[PDB]
């Protein structure tokens, strides 16, 4: 498992790619676990007129 993960991450880094894992952030647990972060970000984005 560690070998597979490290090979995939090396390919990602060598391609010049970044971001979140797509499979993790398509699911609803990620947004009920990071509640505080999401609240703060939503307030900051709204109050500046970016949302």
């Amino acid at each position: 498992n560690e070998c597979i993960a490290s090979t995939s991450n090396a390919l990602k880094v060598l391609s010049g790619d970044e971001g979140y894992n797509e499979d993790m952030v398509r699911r609803a647990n990620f947004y009920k676990e990071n509640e505080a972060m999401l609240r703060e970000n939503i307030e900051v984005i709204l109050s500046n007129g970016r949302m």
Binding site: E18, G19, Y20, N21, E22, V25, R26, E43, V44, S47, N48
Partner: protein, 139 residues
């Protein structure tokens, strides 16, 4: 009284909220939150602070000084000086006294609103698009 002007505060003063006391205020003005003097409590603090902010936001074009606050609320001038300086330091008051106009921008390509494309790369924005598998065995 309706809102007659526009009210701007710096982005780092986002924590400020009337009818609430933040930890920044407690850490910066400790004299009001130690129960050592009976004339300095959180209620008196909110009284003075809301007075200053309300009275400033009625005319943002004018400098709200310490002499007027000292003359209109009762207390020793030193604590009022400290509170006025804290407020004027964190924005929240006197932030738009002598404001200037931004002349006009020239916009090179890709620096403008509605400048986004379907064919542009998705650097962040974690959601990806996949090639639909249209091949007879896969079908």
């Amino acid at each position: 009284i309706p809102q007659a002007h526009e009210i701007v505060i710096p982005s780092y003063s986002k924590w400020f909220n009337l009818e609430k006391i933040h930890s920044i205020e407690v850490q910066s003005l400790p004299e009001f939150f130690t129960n050592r003097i009976p004339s300095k409590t959180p209620e008196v603090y909110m009284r003075y602070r809301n007075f200053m902010v309300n009275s400033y936001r009625l005319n943002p074009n004018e400098y709200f000084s310490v002499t007027t606050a000292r003359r209109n609320v009762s207390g020793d001038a030193a604590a009022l000086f400290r509170l006025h300086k804290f407020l004027t330091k964190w924005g929240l008051i006197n932030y738009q006294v002598d404001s200037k106009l931004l002349p006009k921008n020239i916009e090179p390509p890709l620096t403008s609103q509605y400048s986004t494309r379907h064919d542009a790369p998705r650097g962040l924005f974690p959601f990806e698009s996949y090639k639909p598998s249209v091949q007879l065995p896969d079908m």
